[PDB]
Amino acid sequence: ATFEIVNRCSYTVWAAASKGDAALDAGGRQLNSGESWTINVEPGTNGGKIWARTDCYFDDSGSGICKTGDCGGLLRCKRFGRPPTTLAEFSLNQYGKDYIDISNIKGFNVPMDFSPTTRGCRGVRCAADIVGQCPAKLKAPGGGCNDACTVFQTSEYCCTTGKCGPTEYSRFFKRLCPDAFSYVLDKPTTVTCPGSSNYRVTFCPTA
């Protein structure tokens, strides 16, 4: 399956793609403002994620650091990135269907639209200004807006015991972006698409 990753932001981002234990495609690449990078993700990929990273520096071997989303200092991500990171999430060819969603469970750094480019389902979007409206105690000095599990490390925010409810913090994400997961046990906003669909992830989809 192809995912075209498009940076509509006015700033550079470094796209990253991983299923947690491996890169997807090259795993990572710089996208200047306006650039598009098309990756191929193997069918049957379960638990895939794509995200943006900001204010990165990499040396000639592709080692360095990003202020949001850093995946162990690599340009070419093989693991998930350091919060805060708005997440495009997908599981492909799961008993004949694709599942896609956006999640704010690991915080928010960059607005995002995640849409199929092929027929038979709708896209999801979290493009509100969550960084600018971020509650004081969630603001990441590094840039972006942390989820409350990252900041406070409690069973309630992290949903460790599997029994959590919504919180003042999760309700901020859900209000800014009703169509993204705001906490682990949020009512799902996962979209079911045809097996083997193709996709576009757009950073900063709106003005």
Curated annotation (Swiss-Prot):
Disulfide bonds: 9-204, 56-66, 71-77, 121-193, 126-177, 134-145, 149-158, 159-164
Domain of life: Eukaryota
Protein location: Cytoplasmic vesicle
Cross-referenced PANTHER family: OS03G0233200 PROTEIN
Family under the similarity heading: Belongs to the thaumatin family.
InterPro entries in alphabetical order: Osmotin/thaumatin-like_sf, Thaumatin, Thaumatin_CS
Organism of provenance: Thaumatococcus daniellii
Protein name: Thaumatin I
Principal subcellular localization: cytoplasm
Function: Taste-modifying protein; intensely sweet-tasting. It is 100000 times sweeter than sucrose on a molar basis.
Keyword Disulfide bond: yes
GO cellular component: cytoplasmic vesicle
